[PDB]
Amino acid sequence: SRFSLYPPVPGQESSLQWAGMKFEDVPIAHIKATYNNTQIQVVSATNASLARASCGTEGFRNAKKGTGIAAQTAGIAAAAKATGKGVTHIRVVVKGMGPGRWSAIKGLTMGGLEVISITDNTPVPHXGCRPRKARRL
Amino acid sequence: VESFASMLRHSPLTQLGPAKDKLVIGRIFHIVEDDLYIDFGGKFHCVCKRPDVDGEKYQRGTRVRLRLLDLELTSRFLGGTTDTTILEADAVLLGLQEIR
Amino acid sequence: HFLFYTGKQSYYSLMHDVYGKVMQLEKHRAESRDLIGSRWLIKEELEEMLVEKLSDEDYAQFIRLLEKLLTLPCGPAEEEFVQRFRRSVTI
Amino acid sequence: AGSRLETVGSVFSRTRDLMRAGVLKEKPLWYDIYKAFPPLREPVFRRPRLRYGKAKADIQDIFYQEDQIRAKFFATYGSGQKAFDLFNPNFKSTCQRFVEKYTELQNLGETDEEKLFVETGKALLAEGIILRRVRE
Amino acid sequence: SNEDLPVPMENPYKEPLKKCVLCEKRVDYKNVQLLSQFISPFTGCIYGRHITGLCGKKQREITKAIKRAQKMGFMPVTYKDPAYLKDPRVCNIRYRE
Amino acid sequence: AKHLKFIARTVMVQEGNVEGAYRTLNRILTTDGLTEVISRRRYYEKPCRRRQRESYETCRRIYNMEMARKINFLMRKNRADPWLGC
RNA sequence: UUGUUAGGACCUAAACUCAAUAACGAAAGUAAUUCUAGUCAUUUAUAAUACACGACAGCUAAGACCCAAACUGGGAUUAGAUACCCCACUAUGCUUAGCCAUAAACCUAAAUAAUUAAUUAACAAAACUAUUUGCCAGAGAACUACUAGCCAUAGCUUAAAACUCAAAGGAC
Numbered sequence A: 001s002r003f004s005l006y007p008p009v010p011g012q013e014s015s016l017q018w019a020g021m022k023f024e025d026v027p028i029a030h031i032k033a034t035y036n037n038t039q040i041q042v043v044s045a046t047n048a049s050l051a052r053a054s055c056g057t058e059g060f061r062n063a064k065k066g067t068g069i070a071a072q073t074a075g076i077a078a079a080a081k082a083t084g085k086g087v088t089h090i091r092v093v094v095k096g097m098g099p100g101r102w103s104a105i106k107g108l109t110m111g112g113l114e115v116i117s118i119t120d121n122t123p124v125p126h127x128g129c130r131p132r133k134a135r136r137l
Numbered sequence B: 001v002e003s004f005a006s007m008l009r010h011s012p013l014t015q016l017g018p019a020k021d022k023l024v025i026g027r028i029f030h031i032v033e034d035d036l037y038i039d040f041g042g043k044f045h046c047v048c049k050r051p052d053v054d055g056e057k058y059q060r061g062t063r064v065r066l067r068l069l070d071l072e073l074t075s076r077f078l079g080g081t082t083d084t085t086i087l088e089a090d091a092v093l094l095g096l097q098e099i100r
Numbered sequence C: 001h002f003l004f005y006t007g008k009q010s011y012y013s014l015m016h017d018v019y020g021k022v023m024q025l026e027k028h029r030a031e032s033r034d035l036i037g038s039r040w041l042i043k044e045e046l047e048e049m050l051v052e053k054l055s056d057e058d059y060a061q062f063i064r065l066l067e068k069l070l071t072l073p074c075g076p077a078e079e080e081f082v083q084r085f086r087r088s089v090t091i
Numbered sequence D: 001a002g003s004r005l006e007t008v009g010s011v012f013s014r015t016r017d018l019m020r021a022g023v024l025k026e027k028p029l030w031y032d033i034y035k036a037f038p039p040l041r042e043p044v045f046r047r048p049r050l051r052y053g054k055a056k057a058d059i060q061d062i063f064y065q066e067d068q069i070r071a072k073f074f075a076t077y078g079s080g081q082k083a084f085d086l087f088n089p090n091f092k093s094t095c096q097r098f099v100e101k102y103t104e105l106q107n108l109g110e111t112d113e114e115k116l117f118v119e120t121g122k123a124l125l126a127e128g129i130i131l132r133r134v135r136e
Numbered sequence E: 001s002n003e004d005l006p007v008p009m010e011n012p013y014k015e016p017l018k019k020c021v022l023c024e025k026r027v028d029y030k031n032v033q034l035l036s037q038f039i040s041p042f043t044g045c046i047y048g049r050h051i052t053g054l055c056g057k058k059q060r061e062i063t064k065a066i067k068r069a070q071k072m073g074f075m076p077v078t079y080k081d082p083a084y085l086k087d088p089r090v091c092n093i094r095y096r097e
Numbered sequence F: 001a002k003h004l005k006f007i008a009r010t011v012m013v014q015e016g017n018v019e020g021a022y023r024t025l026n027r028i029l030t031t032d033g034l035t036e037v038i039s040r041r042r043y044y045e046k047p048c049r050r051r052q053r054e055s056y057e058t059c060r061r062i063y064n065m066e067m068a069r070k071i072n073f074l075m076r077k078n079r080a081d082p083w084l085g086c
Numbered sequence G: 001u002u003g004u005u006a007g008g009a010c011c012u013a014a015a016c017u018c019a020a021u022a023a024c025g026a027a028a029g030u031a032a033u034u035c036u037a038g039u040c041a042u043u044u045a046u047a048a049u050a051c052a053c054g055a056c057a058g059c060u061a062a063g064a065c066c067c068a069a070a071c072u073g074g075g076a077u078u079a080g081a082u083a084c085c086c087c088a089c090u091a092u093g094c095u096u097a098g099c100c101a102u103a104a105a106c107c108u109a110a111a112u113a114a115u116u117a118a119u120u121a122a123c124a125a126a127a128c129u130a131u132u133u134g135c136c137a138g139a140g141a142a143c144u145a146c147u148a149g150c151c152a153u154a155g156c157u158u159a160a161a162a163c164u165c166a167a168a169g170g171a172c
């Protein structure tokens, strides 16, 4: 009789629907937030591309391409393309820990899309590849 | 004349055993605002807060009931050579004792 | 005087009296504005009464103790006492 | 002129020395009193030091034979619901009455601790004391 | 000499030593229901002994069983199994809102 | 990669509060230490550097937790003066 | 090129959390999982011209190669920038054989058995006794010259003097 933060377990049967679709059917908004450019892609649950955007494609350049307001504009642009294709609910898998990590999610909301969940897929190696050397400053 | 060794063996404090979670009778001797200083027969007094219920009843000389925890609050800290003491006892005020 | 070796025998003799008065009132047990338009004597005035020199911390402590006396039930003896340390204010 | 050296000797020895030297011409008034009724220990300075290695203090833990019985009573029944009054010099607690009866039975010659503990509970029950065997 | 002098003995009132919630119990890699009580629901990361509250010996036993179960095909690595989400909470950690 | 998608590190939005859900997801990742781990994996920390940092952070946590105990312990005596005037 | 893949291949390289732990080993070093082999009794200290080891870098031959990266090239900065910052890419870090034998190889604490009081140069890591070996004798010249040994050849270990100075050095 309460809300569950935990996503509906896959393979089972749940009582939660969004526009007549189950959790496994809602399209996914893949946000890659890096320290320079924030890219956004929306796909259907069958992995078919519907919208794409990024600070670069919007027209920002160099250090402006990696700001919060630049990602917000990129999110609004991705929403508009997806909204035309017929998307109202999105599952936000946000990879990356850059400046437009949250702003890209805020732009998608401003653009008329309804986020039902937020996942994080930032790559965390379990022991992997040696990172580049520390910068001296 | 009774010896000191006998006096200690038959002392109420020796009978109490460990003072953790024991019940004792105290007497209020000093009040500062809503803080009650209660003597329960030990070396150090305890300091409790005036209960909301029957607050006016807790006046000086009033005997109360307590649940002891420590007779002296002390603790050695990292790098210390001696235990730091606050010269106070620990008890939980339960309420007035029935005069009966 | 028994408080000679304190170095402030007159300041501490007065703080002895007011602390003993406070104890008897607290043990033994109305509006406290018996006097209005009055101020506490300034440090320079207190020093003259005691015929000795005080610090700012010594003056502040004397007032806090006198305020506590007024808070408690006060017989006419206490009111006359605190009166000696009150100077009439002229508006 | 004096001996303000409080880390060598004692007040009495330093006063004895100053008079022998010739600097202190009159005995202090407390001198003859100390000479006739000295303290048990000489008041000489000593620097406190920590113990190291396997050196230990010499303090006996005070444990009477009644404590073996008292420990069982607190574990089985806790502290008596009646509150301790530590202001009455002759107070008899519920636990102290248990230990007095437990001793009486043991004087008769009972050798089993289990026998003495369950019999004592019965005797106090006859007396009317309310003993609650609180496992909680 | 004196009958009332104290008697040397071990402390009658000595309090018992506190045990961990897995004291004198068998930690098995196949018991994934118990192992899941010491990992994170979201990331599946093993909790430290400051959160779990276990002793050193059991902290190592749980750690070895989790790694063995994960590597042998009994326990998931990246998350806690959703079946075991309802089990009792034994760890001093709060995540909700 | 071989696990199931949308179970790990996933939070559900309640009543369209997309900011509240994002704030919860961050506390989960910060609490599990993923945020610090990802921060330090951008560049390489040398093994000697890693050991020096961990030994210092451990000793800083001991002295901090111990200082908290000493303040909390000595703050019990912090109350209105009972012997005002003496 | 980029993003996604609940697609395939790969098994190269490295082992998050646990680890706020302080274990194992002579030291070096060692923490993904499993199995096999395996550490153990000399009273104790005390060893080289002998034996066996010894991070990283480096050399030799055949492989590996995800990522990192001396050098090198390209781009910036600057009076210059043979650098710090950016990008690319080697030797190299990996495996298998052998060599090399050096580290601030530093707990800057030789080992062992006692003691905690009849004991503050300073700081660090409280003081101090006994036993055995090693080592030291102002600073620089000098991790140098010469000698001998060594798979080492721009190498390692061993290791002076002339000459110069009246200080050098440690703690506060």
Ligand code: FES
Pocket (backbone or CB within 6 Å): E018, E019, E020, E022, E023, E024, E054, E055, E057, E058
């Ligand atoms: S306290 Fe006994 S095994 Fe943990």
Ligand SMILES: [K+]
Pocket (backbone or CB within 6 Å): G106
């Ligand atoms: K070192």
Ligand SMILES: [Mg+2]
Pocket (backbone or CB within 6 Å): none
């Ligand atoms: Mg260049």
Ligand SMILES: [Mg+2]
Pocket (backbone or CB within 6 Å): none
């Ligand atoms: Mg290469």
Ligand SMILES: [Mg+2]
Pocket (backbone or CB within 6 Å): none
């Ligand atoms: Mg060497």
Ligand SMILES: [Mg+2]
Pocket (backbone or CB within 6 Å): none
């Ligand atoms: Mg080393």
Ligand SMILES: [Mg+2]
Pocket (backbone or CB within 6 Å): G143
């Ligand atoms: Mg060299």
Ligand SMILES: [Mg+2]
Pocket (backbone or CB within 6 Å): none
């Ligand atoms: Mg040479």
Ligand SMILES: [Mg+2]
Pocket (backbone or CB within 6 Å): none
């Ligand atoms: Mg040579």
